[PDB]
Amino acid sequence: CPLMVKVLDAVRGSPAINVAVHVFRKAADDTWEPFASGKTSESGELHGLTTEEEFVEGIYKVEIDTKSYWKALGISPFHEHAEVVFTANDSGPRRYTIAALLSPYSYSTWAVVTN
Amino acid sequence: CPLMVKVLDAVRGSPAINVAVHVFRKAADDTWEPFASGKTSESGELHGLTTEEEFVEGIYKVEIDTKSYWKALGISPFHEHAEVVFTANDSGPRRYTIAALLSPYSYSTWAVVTN
Amino acid sequence: CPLMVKVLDAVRGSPAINVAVHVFRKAADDTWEPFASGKTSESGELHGLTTEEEFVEGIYKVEIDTKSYWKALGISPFHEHAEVVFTANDSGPRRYTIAALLSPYSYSTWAVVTN
Amino acid sequence: CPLMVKVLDAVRGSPAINVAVHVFRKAADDTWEPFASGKTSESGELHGLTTEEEFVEGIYKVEIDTKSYWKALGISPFHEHAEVVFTANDSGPRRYTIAALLSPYSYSTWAVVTN
């Protein structure tokens, strides 16, 4: 599991469950190609998006569908989604955790990268 | 100006100066059209991006070039840039401040919407 | 004023108004002595807490009464308050801005120190 | 394990290892009584601070020794420590994760509370 996504809810103090996550990889023609997608679990985590074989060097975009999450809770939030864009595996394979802590008008996002 | 961008540096405890900022508006064909751009001032602020006349309801993207900022400081960053995507809605008079607090492997972003 | 406090609300996307703020300075006996206090304005800012003469090097604590703020909004909070503890150091001319971005179960706090 | 502390480093994109953490509980005389302490592991986590029996209702303070952490990395940080003050177990036993994401001039802290 070289790529994991974790989402937390700062209003409730809980994992953000059933959040849609779409991952894209930048192609040679400079366009965003769909790479993987899924929904966060009861722990606010999304595992099994990819494999070490498939997750080659490149520029990746993780789109976290925060608006649909807040709308289902009765909040009209500010952002359409939280977008995380980064170069992966350029010095060899790494394990990446992309995390976001969500509020209606804000989000904090960070990465934990391990060898 | 109805749209202001503010960028802060959490490593130095200072405004993030000379940061490139690009604003886009989503077109009918679903593509991102360049809308406005600039560089943050000595106060980490970017004023005068648009006018009330030009800034109509729509979906906007604010791209903050964080990678170039960290590279100029000799600090290895994670993100290619920080992206803020939101709908501008005419619910009475409004001013939008899009802010970001930057760290090499994280950023927090928020919006202050006032009348 | 060499010390300003700014508080923002991440649920509403607005300044956090009428928030009580208490500043303390650590005394020789290791206890926290009241130093200054006030309430944030309509811009979420608290100015005029001290003067350059009074604000000597020392360890200071800024306590932001977040619980009372959330309770007045009918939102169940986690923290009793947000506490910022720091040393003020005379390394040339300095102005300190202590800022906090509040959510019910989280807060981000940062400092902008300028000349 | 009803109380766990997790600390992350936003400069390195890694767990914050060997961070000292002190927990206090407010006593009847309004003073902070030492309750538990420890150091974060290689995963940036501190488990086994207390037991369900010992962790009774009360006001608790978790002091995360961020200054010593940054000083050991060659950074002179802004804060003396990150302080998290909260009421625990007032509606019955809960499991609490207190987390902090650290930068030299900023920190974000949140709680994940589960039943």
Residue numbers in the entry:
A (entry chain B), B (entry chain A), C (entry chain A), D (entry chain B): 10 to 124
From the paper:
In its native tetrameric conformation, TTR transports retinol-binding protein and thyroxine (T4) in the blood and cerebrospinal fluid. Amyloid aggregation of TTR occurs by dissociation of tetrameric TTR into monomers; these partially unfold into amyloidogenic intermediates and self-associate into soluble oligomers and amyloid aggregates. Here we identify two segments of TTR that drive protein aggregation by self-association and formation of steric zipper spines of amyloid fibrils.
Therefore, we decided to disrupt the capacity for a steric zipper by strand H by substituting residues Thr119 and Val121 with the bulky residues tyrosine and tryptophan. The size of these side chains is expected to prevent formation of tightly packed steric zippers formed from amino acids with short side chains such as Thr119 and Val121. Aggregation assays of TTR variants showed that the mutants T119W, T119Y, V121W, and V121Y did not produce aggregates after 4 days of incubation. The side chain organization in this peptide also explains why the residue replacements T119W, T119Y, V121W, and V121Y impede TTR aggregation. First, peptides with Tyr/Trp substitutions did not form fibrils in isolation. These experiments suggest that strand H plays a role during TTR aggregation by acting as a fibril-forming segment.
